[PDB]
Write an enzyme that holds these catalytic residues in place. Structure first.
Site, PDB file in Angstrom:
ATOM      1  N   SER A 173     -11.547  -1.467   0.452  1.00 13.31           N
ATOM      2  CA  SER A 173     -10.131  -1.448   0.883  1.00 13.31           C
ATOM      3  C   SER A 173      -9.973  -1.777   2.385  1.00 13.31           C
ATOM      4  O   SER A 173      -8.891  -2.176   2.798  1.00 13.31           O
ATOM      5  CB  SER A 173      -9.462  -0.135   0.632  1.00 13.31           C
ATOM      6  OG  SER A 173      -9.069  -0.042  -0.747  1.00 13.31           O
ATOM      7  N   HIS A 195      -3.657   5.642   4.023  1.00 15.13           N
ATOM      8  CA  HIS A 195      -4.325   4.382   3.604  1.00 15.13           C
ATOM      9  C   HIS A 195      -3.693   3.164   4.203  1.00 15.13           C
ATOM     10  O   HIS A 195      -4.327   2.343   4.930  1.00 15.13           O
ATOM     11  CB  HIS A 195      -4.335   4.399   2.050  1.00 15.13           C
ATOM     12  CG  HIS A 195      -5.233   3.421   1.439  1.00 15.13           C
ATOM     13  ND1 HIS A 195      -4.752   2.279   0.782  1.00 15.13           N
ATOM     14  CD2 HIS A 195      -6.587   3.361   1.384  1.00 15.13           C
ATOM     15  CE1 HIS A 195      -5.797   1.559   0.371  1.00 15.13           C
ATOM     16  NE2 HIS A 195      -6.905   2.202   0.705  1.00 15.13           N
ATOM     17  N   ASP A 229       0.825  -1.221   0.000  1.00 17.84           N
ATOM     18  CA  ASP A 229       0.000   0.000   0.000  1.00 17.84           C
ATOM     19  C   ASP A 229       0.852   1.261   0.000  1.00 17.84           C
ATOM     20  O   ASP A 229       1.928   1.340  -0.637  1.00 17.84           O
ATOM     21  CB  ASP A 229      -0.975  -0.184   1.162  1.00 17.84           C
ATOM     22  CG  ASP A 229      -2.312   0.489   1.116  1.00 17.84           C
ATOM     23  OD1 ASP A 229      -3.313  -0.300   1.312  1.00 17.84           O
ATOM     24  OD2 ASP A 229      -2.400   1.718   0.939  1.00 17.84           O
ATOM     25  N   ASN A 275     -14.719  -0.204  -5.474  1.00 17.74           N
ATOM     26  CA  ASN A 275     -15.857   0.560  -4.934  1.00 17.74           C
ATOM     27  C   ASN A 275     -16.685   1.116  -6.121  1.00 17.74           C
ATOM     28  O   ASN A 275     -16.985   2.341  -6.028  1.00 17.74           O
ATOM     29  CB  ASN A 275     -15.409   1.670  -4.007  1.00 17.74           C
ATOM     30  CG  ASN A 275     -14.506   1.211  -2.879  1.00 17.74           C
ATOM     31  OD1 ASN A 275     -14.793   0.172  -2.183  1.00 17.74           O
ATOM     32  ND2 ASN A 275     -13.427   1.945  -2.690  1.00 17.74           N
TER      33      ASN A 275
END
Ligand SMILES: [Ca+2]
Ligand SMILES: [Ca+2]
Length: 275
Positions: free
Chosen positions: A221, A64, A32, A155
């Site tokens: 996520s 994130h 990430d 998403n």
């Protein structure tokens, strides 16, 4: 005081904890934006940065990666939250910059580092509308090598009869994860399609943020990490199981919800899955 995020409870992680399984000795790679090493509720085992403009993997400029990380393994202590597998060995593989973006080359480099360093599980809370032959070869290499690969489904909600699963989640060798709320109802933004495999909590997920903070995020996520963490627990109890078995177990012990187009096999249950 430490709080146990409901999502942890929702997949039944705490049951394994009471049996004494919390994912000790399982190497988990969080591919990430990096992981904030200054956070007291996280213990980082190592990492590497694939971002040429940001070489320290331990510097999360996006927030994130730190959030995802806390879902997987926020320490069992007197503060913050608690991860699915609090004893798992966390690796920070930074493939996204400050803006949350990354080149495919950086991501593939990240996946290769993970393979070369024997990670047991890889988590990719990221997706793109387009795949590449190189991205496919990399994930296929990871599964072949025995790593368990988990990724957000995307998403992009629904689009009639069309699959809205993003890459790399779309690849058959990857475990694509969609999101449900606390009620087990599919999140309106959760991607759908034949490639959706399982569901996990993705609504209002409390976890760690850079600078010794905590906060909630919504998204597939946020869902992925729950599964990667489940995998770590499974591996802690059955260090011998292949990635094949871990995956099969997670998909064969789910709590069935609605149509697989929208829910895959349903919500994971690590207590069942772990045998
Ligand atoms: Ca804690
Ligand atoms: Ca898949």
């Amino acid at each position: 005081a430490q709080s146990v995020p409901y999502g942890v409870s929702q997949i039944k992680a705490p049951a394994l904890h009471s049996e004494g399984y919390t994912g000790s000795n399982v190497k988990v790679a969080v591919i990430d934006s990096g992981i904030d090493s200054s956070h007291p509720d996280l213990k980082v085992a190592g990492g590497a940065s694939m971002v040429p403009s940001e070489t320290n993997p331990f510097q999360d400029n996006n927030s994130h990666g730190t959030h995802v990380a806390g879902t997987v393994a926020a320490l069992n202590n007197s503060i913050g939250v608690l991860g699915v597998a609090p004893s798992a060995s966390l690796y920070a593989v930074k493939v996204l910059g400050a803006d949350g973006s990354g080149q495919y080359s950086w991501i593939i480099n990240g996946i290769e580092w993970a393979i070369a360093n024997n990670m047991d599980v890889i988590n990719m809370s990221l997706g793109g509308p387009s795949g590449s032959a190189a991205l496919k070869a990399a994930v296929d290499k990871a599964v072949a090598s025995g790593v368990v690969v988990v990724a957000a489904a995307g998403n992009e909600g629904t689009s009639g009869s069309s699959s809205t699963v993003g890459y790399p989640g779309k690849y058959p060798s990857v475990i694509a994860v969609g999101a449900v709320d606390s009620s087990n109802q599919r999140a309106s933004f959760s991607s759908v399609g034949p490639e959706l495999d399982v569901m996990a909590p993705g609504v209002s997920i409390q976890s760690t943020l850079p600078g010794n903070k905590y906060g909630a995020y919504n998204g597939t996520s946020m869902a992925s990490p729950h599964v990667a963490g489940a995998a770590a627990l499974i591996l802690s109890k059955h260090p011998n199981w292949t990635n094949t078995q871990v995956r099969s177990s997670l998909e064969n012990t789910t709590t069935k919800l609605g149509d697989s187009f929208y829910y895959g096999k349903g919500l994971i249950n690590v207590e069942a899955a772990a045998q």
